[PDB]
Swiss-Prot record, chain A:
The modification Phosphoserine is found at residue 362. This is V-type proton ATPase catalytic subunit A. It catalyses: ATP + H2O + 4 H(+)(in) = ADP + phosphate + 5 H(+)(out). It comes from Bos taurus. Transmembrane segments: none annotated. Keywords: ATP-binding, Cytoplasm, Cytoplasmic vesicle, Hydrogen ion transport, Ion transport, Lysosome, Membrane, Nucleotide-binding, Phosphoprotein, Translocase, Transport. ATP hydrolysis occurs at the interface between the nucleotide-binding domains of subunits A and B. ATP hydrolysis triggers a conformational change in the subunits D and F, which induces a shift of subunit d. The c-ring is subsequently rotated and results in a continuous proton translocation across the membrane. The V-ATPase is inhibited by bafilomycin A. The lineage of its organism: Eukaryota, Metazoa, Chordata, Craniata, Vertebrata. PROSITE patterns: ATPASE_ALPHA_BETA. Catalytic subunit of the V1 complex of vacuolar(H+)-ATPase (V-ATPase), a multisubunit enzyme composed of a peripheral complex (V1) that hydrolyzes ATP and a membrane integral complex (V0) that translocates protons. V-ATPase is responsible for acidifying and maintaining the pH of intracellular compartments and in some cell types, is targeted to the plasma membrane, where it is responsible for acidifying the extracellular environment. GO terms for cellular component: clathrin-coated vesicle membrane; cytosol; lysosome; plasma membrane; transport vesicle; vacuolar proton-transporting V-type ATPase, V1 domain. Its EC number is 7.1.2.2. Phosphorylation at Ser-362 by AMPK down-regulates its enzyme activity. GO terms for molecular function: ATP binding; ATP hydrolysis activity; proton-transporting ATPase activity, rotational mechanism.
Swiss-Prot record, chain E:
Transmembrane segments: none annotated. Pfam families: ATP-synt_ab, ATP-synt_ab_N, ATP-synt_VA_C. PROSITE patterns: ATPASE_ALPHA_BETA. This is V-type proton ATPase subunit B, brain isoform. SUPFAM superfamilies: P-loop containing nucleoside triphosphate hydrolases (SSF52540). GO terms for molecular function: ATP binding; proton-transporting ATPase activity, rotational mechanism.
């Protein structure tokens, strides 16, 4: 029956009568300005609609036309380097079309520009008359020098090729492919429309084995993350993922961001260039932003999370490695508390809805290393890093407590380390990672030194912690000598290894050979000094750490200056670790 | 353009409870539509439609439901939403919380009528604040510096001098250019009203102060539209006739109390502590109207004051404002009992836009490191001050006595300055270096040697 | 005598303050036993 | 040598015996009756949330019965 | 007792709100019926009936409500309750939450159909547990040993390896060699993608899969299926035990993730939440699945439970480790103190306790010295923990020769007895031999918990 009539509106929710053959979560267009809405409850003839835009001035009796399709995004060329809102309207194209500074809340601009021409090529191993199923790489379009946007068939359908396009320039609306099925010849363009609440089909899920090199030294050594994993931080910092973070495309979903802090994201990203092959290339060629501030309506906060993960699964299927950074899921979670109160639903603890842990589970578990659909047989991965409430409700908070039952990695940023300006403020006691059994196959092959060091480095950091409560009560005067050798090396770990400056031009990204390099010397220093005091005890005149700490003052300076080697060495940086190691072997021969 | 249809007038009120009037038999009612209530005495009250269903319309009145009849009260429906008359004569004029004059002036003579909800700013064409606003207070300038176009609240309590330090940073606006001051005062006393009214005319600032206010004898439903009437004139001056506006919103807890009173009358599903679940959305729609845009050169800066109840930062009002706004200023009661002025506890205070406001081009060079160390010694010195009472006075280090001497020097020389000192930023950092020189070398770990070598031997 | 406001987070904070105070007894009582045992054996000497 | 060790030990074991009892009598009971105040004040918020949510459900049956 | 009447198909949906679909004009609806939803595009969804009121039948769809029309969808009422197809051939098969195979396998041929809720056991016919279950972990077998019919949770936190010791005590469980009909039903509830793939790659690829009945339930598949998952797992563990007469060890993880599924369907019924959001009937609902254990009078099989759950914010006052403390029989603790010390399994034995370990061990059951070597290893670890702090605050020289010996005991107790590695299956005799090696470093007349009738043999070796 095509149309509806507004029966009532109270804020975002709109009740619409004469809506009989309407399905749940369809998109409707309410009002004379055609505000985008979504059916969230239907009772007989009347349907309840949450609107993604502001319903100020909607009257009773306005038409509600239904579209017969759920909330979906357009997937095709013209999407890298773009900036969208929650419902995927391009903020860069909508300011050039209207020439104002406002969003007119009635403007149905297409997400991908149908005017820009893209140079299409075919698979080359695909003839006419070939059979083709969903997920097959059908063509290749180069949007930039970095990204080869592989055109793929949608995973719903199947057929036989009757027409393929010659290599040339086409729009996003030109027909590129004809497929013959049993019934009807069907057209195909360079864009596909996929619902954001529906998980994208794929061949078979794979275990994650390769690590994600964050660049931070505590994050890569103690609590490592993999590509295809799930991470949660209590959070722009993040440019380590932007310049390296070894993944092919990056997306960034700002959900509930502040206005002058969303403005700092979309101002420096075009002019934050990285290194690839000696060429100084900008990260915006492999970045796409979903910008949703807190001024924007509440139903778009829910759509902005599902928009991002749908784009992230889309570039997963081409064979790329996607790293998605979802910023604040406490805001996303708050939209869910706001909408559930407007539908008169019953709350769970602290006013949040009862399905809070299920909505987070349907988003975090869309990430993983996985073999994609289609005949060219490629493999992709999606990594998700989501932010939660930063200083409060430490492990008992409905957003944080529901997240930790899902995610595998949790880099707990401490406020007490941040008050003393210890950066990064990831504290090592409550943080964890669960990809430690999955990475020992990689760590026994490529960096075989590492595993007995990280086992011992975590012991020294807690041996200081169990002894830090001793010194603040009774004092350092009655401390032992196997204990004072922990309090100096662990303090050497917290200042050299764990501390890292993100704006300093050599500590803004620390590669993994540099991380294993300086860690292997700070624990060999711990093992040799343990060796000196223990076997030579109570008979031989061996130093009880007081004559060592002044005599190693040049050598302890070499350990503390080891975080200064750069990008202007790899060979020189490797041999200097072996230089400082053979320096210590002479000292222990005394 | 102009609407020329005659307004319908219904004598069909069917419920009155609290602030809300319920109508029936209304023909096609709009949402957020302004209604004019004519009492049986002949007095006129305004209104705003909060909910429609079929022929039923729920309208909240702005002046209260006292004396509203069921048979004899007539209300006419104005076919559009609430629009404020905005013009460049409102600078230097005093209205009330509804936009009606108080200072014996005439009605407003607008060049245009602007919607109180405003238009949503496109995030792509919004430029990022980097120019630092000096306030003259070393607790604000040195540690938590404010950019030009930054939303930054003042977290206070009941009985603390937040109004005294608000007027101080209102008359000292720095920028090392005649800030146009829009002042919304919601739920203030008469003594709070006469404090701000007399202070602005004492300095001659009321040539360009657009103060309009709402006392406690005034009804509470005027406090809902009072920030929205404040920012729809402040963005007429920042974004359309390019002034450099500075908006002060007090008290933002008295606005949320009026929001809870309406949501309790509508029998809504409450959030934390009875406040509505949409309080995060309502506070963000009057906070995010700040910043500056790329085509204009005017800007709008928001300093919304709010007194949190029972000294609780985990209350729903100062917690939700911590998520929207870009760093808070924490007025402390413990420093106020020690007779310290700007009792600003700098340890939970923050300014997230302070990184791009300081450096080489804007302030002098050592700003990023002296404030990084003045925070650091204050954080450890407050920690050893709690250990001075528990275990011992002379206990467990001689270096703690330097930390307990830093506390007497920080709270009495840096932050305590009096209500008329206009310190420049170079005076602020040089005062902070005088408190850092009582510390010796190789404890100043946040300051690099490229900047420590100049200012320690001074 | 009460100190701070109840939030569901202060309870974990106050249990951490209680935990250090519970171990501030036994770690300091046994010091007061180690001092008294030498104080009693010096008196016999 | 045993005289000057004896006379400085009991004046250093009195200051340890006070620091134990100041914990046992002044600090530990103050934290424990603070923690008792956290429990009963959090139970009083749960009855306020129970009374509000049951009142919504009672009003939701009123509108359902007429409609 | 066959039902032979055909099934009715209703096209009469009236309301959709949340997971619930409201139907009208239903002919005599039963309360817990399974229904089949046919979508307008042809996709099939299942669902239970949540509430029936005269003609109205309120069903809740399992897989979600998205796309359900008001005019075109068609509900298919199956007249019966949810029944579990049970057999012995579900041993070495991976099933998902609801009922379905996961390792590309066939549907089970099902020699009986059993109700998932079951019926409560007779207290008069439930006999007391006596024999021991061997888990292969010295922290469990030596110190806190479990009986045949005991229920005993493992109290953990987030990030701690409670899933790595869940897969361990399923991979190397046995009844004691004693010189026999053993199965394991594993219910994995609310696990991740990586925790689900870890469980299949373990059991299967370790050879244990001749007696495992492993039931997955991930975080994607619906939250209503988390409720029917341990009812499914204990229905198959009541058919193998005292209907096929074999000893079954049931592992339920995570039992903290069960209750948020219990909290979610509670608010779907518009029920007012109790204390801390969890419903008031949670002590009954945890009792329906914890008390399906024990051994009975005239049957040789038994069933014992290890419900593994994580306490939130390390708080035992939380109702998830509190309501399981009123009903189960001792706890095992996974602590973050030993986990950060790189000790696996990170089990501390001072606050851990097994309330039915006096019955489990004994002369005929493991051997005679088990009651005394565990009492002595608990005593020396408690005393050795006290002297471990006096090395810090008093001095390494001030402590005596005997207190130095407790220092050297604790360094070898946490590294040789407790720490064992994820693949070392120590039997209960190898456990006590390691325990006697750590007691032999002490001289005589300090081992006061061991009488001289057993100390004379096992000490000289």
């Amino acid at each position: 029956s095509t149309f509806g009539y507004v029966h009532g509106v109270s804020g975002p929710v709109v009740t619409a009568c004469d809506m009989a053959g309407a399905a749940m979560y369809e998109l409707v267009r309410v009002g004379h300005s055609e505000l985008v809405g979504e059916i969230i409850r239907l009772e007989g003839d009347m349907a309840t609609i949450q609107v993604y835009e502001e319903t100020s001035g909607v009257s009773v009796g306005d038409p509600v036309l239904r579209t017969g399709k759920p909330l979906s995004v357009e997937l095709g060329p013209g999407i890298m380097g773009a900036i969208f809102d929650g419902i995927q309207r391009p903020l860069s194209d909508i300011s050039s079309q209207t020439q104002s500074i406002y969003i007119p809340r009635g403007v149905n601009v297409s997400a991908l520009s149908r005017d820009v021409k893209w140079d299409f090529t075919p698979c080359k191993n695909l003839r006419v008359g070939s059979h083709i199923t969903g997920g097959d790489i059908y063509g290749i379009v180069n949007e930039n020098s970095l990204i080869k946007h592989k055109i793929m068939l949608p995973p719903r359908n199947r057929g036989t090729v009757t027409y393929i396009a010659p290599p040339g320039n086409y729009d996003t609306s030109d027909v590129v492919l004809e497929l013959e099925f049993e019934g009807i010849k069907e057209k195909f363009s360079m864009v596909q429309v996929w619902p954001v609440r529906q998980v994208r089909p794929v061949t078979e899920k794979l275990p994650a084995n390769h690590p994600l090199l964050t660049g931070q030294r505590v994050l890569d050594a103690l609590f490592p993350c993999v590509q295809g994993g799930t991470t949660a931080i209590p959070g722009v910092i993040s440019q380590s993922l932007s310049k390296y973070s070894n993944s092919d495309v990056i997306i960034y979903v700002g959900c509930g961001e502040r206005g002058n802090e969303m403005s700092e994201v979309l101002r420096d990203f075009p002019e934050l260039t990285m290194e690839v092959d000696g060429k100084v290339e900008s990260i915006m060629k492999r970045t796409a932003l979903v910008a949703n501030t807190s001024n924007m309506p509440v139903a778009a906060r829910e759509a902005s999370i599902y928009t991002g993960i749908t784009l992230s699964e889309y570039f997963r299927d081409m064979g790329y490695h996607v790293s998605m950074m979802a910023d604040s899921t406490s805001r996303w979670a708050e939209a869910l508390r706001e909408i559930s109160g407007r539908l008169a639903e019953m709350p769970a603890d602290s006013g949040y809805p009862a399905y809070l842990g299920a909505r987070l589970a349907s988003f975090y578990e869309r990430a993983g290393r996985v073999k994609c659909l289609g005949n060219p047989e490629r493999e992709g991965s999606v990594s998700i890093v989501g932010a939660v409430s930063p200083p409060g409700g430490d492990f008992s908070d409905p957003v944080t407590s529901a997240t930790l039952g899902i995610v595998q990695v949790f880099w707990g940023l401490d406020k007490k380390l941040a008050q003393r300006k210890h950066f990064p403020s990831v504290n090592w006691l409550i943080s964890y990672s669960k990809y430690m059994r999955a990475l020992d196959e990689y760590y026994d092959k490529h960096f075989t030194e590492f595993v007995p060091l990280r086992t011992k480095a975590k012991e020294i950091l807690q041996e200081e912690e169990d002894l830090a409560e001793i010194v603040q009560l009774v004092g350092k005067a009655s401390l032992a000598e196997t204990d004072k050798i922990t309090l100096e090396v662990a303090k050497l770990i917290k200042d050299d290894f764990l501390q890292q400056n993100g704006y300093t031009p050599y500590d803004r990204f620390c590669p993994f050979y540099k991380t294993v390099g300086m860690l292997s010397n700070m624990i060999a220093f711990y093992d040799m000094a343990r060796r000196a005091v223990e076997t030579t005890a109570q008979s031989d005149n061996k130093i009880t750490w007081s004559i060592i700490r002044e005599h190693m003052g040049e050598i302890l300076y070499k350990l503390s200056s080891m975080k200064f080697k750069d990008p202007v060495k790899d060979g020189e940086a490797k041999i200097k670790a072996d230089y400082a190691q053979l320096l210590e072997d002479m000292q222990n021969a005394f | 353009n102009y609407l020329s249809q005659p307004r319908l007038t219904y004598k069909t009120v069917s419920g009155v409870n609290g602030p809300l009037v319920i109508l029936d038999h209304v023909k096609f009612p709009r949402y957020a539509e302004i209604v004019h209530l004519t009492l049986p005495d002949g007095t006129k009250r305004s209104g705003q439609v909060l909910e429609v269903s079929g022929s039923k319309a729920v309208v909240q009145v702005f002046e209260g439901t006292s004396g509203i009849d069921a048979k004899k009260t007539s209300c006419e429906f104005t076919g559009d939403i609430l629009r404020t008359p905005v013009s460049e004569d409102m600078l230097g004029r005093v209205f009330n919380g509804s936009g009606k004059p108080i200072d014996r002036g005439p009605v407003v003579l607008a060049e245009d009528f602007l919607d109180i909800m405003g238009q949503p700013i496109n995030p792509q064409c919004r430029i990022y604040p980097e120019e630092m606003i000096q306030t003259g207070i070393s607790a604000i300038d040195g540690m938590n510096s404010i950019a030009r176009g930054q939303k930054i609240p003042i977290f206070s309590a009941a009985g603390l001098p937040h109004n005294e330090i608000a007027a101080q940073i209102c008359r000292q606006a720095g920028l090392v250019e005649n800030f146009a001051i829009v002042f919304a005062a919601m739920g203030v006393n008469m003594e709070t009203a006469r404090f701000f009214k007399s202070d602005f005319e004492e300095n001659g600032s009321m040539d360009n102060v657009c103060l309009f206010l709402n006392l406690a004898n005034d009804p509470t439903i005027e406090r809902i539209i009072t920030p929205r009437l404040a920012l729809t004139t402040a963005e007429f001056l920042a974004y359309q006739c390019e002034k450099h506006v500075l908006v002060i919103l007090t008290d933002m807890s008295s606005y949320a109390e009026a929001l809870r009173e309406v949501s309790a009358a509508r029998e809504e599903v409450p959030g934390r502590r009875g406040f509505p679940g949409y309080m995060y959305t309502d506070l963000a729609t009057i906070y995010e109207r700040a910043g500056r845009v790329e085509g204009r050169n005017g800007s709008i800066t928001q300093i919304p004051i709010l007194t949190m109840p029972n000294d609780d930062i985990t209350h729903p009002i100062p917690d939700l404002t911590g998520y929207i706004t870009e760093g808070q200023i924490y007025v402390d009661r413990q420093l106020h009992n020690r007779q310290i002025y700007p009792p600003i506890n700098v340890l939970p205070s923050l300014s997230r836009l302070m990184k791009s406001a300081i450096g080489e081009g804007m302030t002098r060079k050592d700003h990023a490191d002296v404030s990084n160390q003045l925070y650091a010694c204050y954080a450890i010195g407050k920690d050893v001050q709690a250990m001075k009472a528990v275990v011992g006075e002379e206990a467990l280090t001689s270096d703690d006595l330097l930390y307990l001497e830093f506390l007497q020097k920080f709270e009495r020389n840096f932050i305590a300055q009096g209500p008329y000192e206009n310190r420049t930023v170079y005076e602020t950092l040089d005062i902070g270096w005088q408190l850092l020189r009582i510390f010796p070398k190789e404890m100043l770990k946040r300051i690099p040697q490229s900047t420590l070598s100049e200012f320690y031997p001074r | 005598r009460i100190e701070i406001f109840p939030s569901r987070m202060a309870q974990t904070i106050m249990k951490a303050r209680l935990k250090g105070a519970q171990t501030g007894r036994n770690l300091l009582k046994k010091k007061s036993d180690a001092l008294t045992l030498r104080f009693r054996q010096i008196l016999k000497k | 040598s045993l005289q000057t060790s004896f006379v400085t030990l009991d004046e250093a074991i009195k200051i340890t015996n006070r620091r134990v009892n100041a914990i046992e009598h002044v600090i530990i009971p103050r934290i424990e009756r603070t923690l008792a105040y956290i429990i009963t004040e959090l139970d009083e918020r749960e009855r306020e949330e129970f009374y509000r949510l049951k009142k919504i459900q009672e009003k939701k049956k009123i509108l359902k019965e007429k409609s």
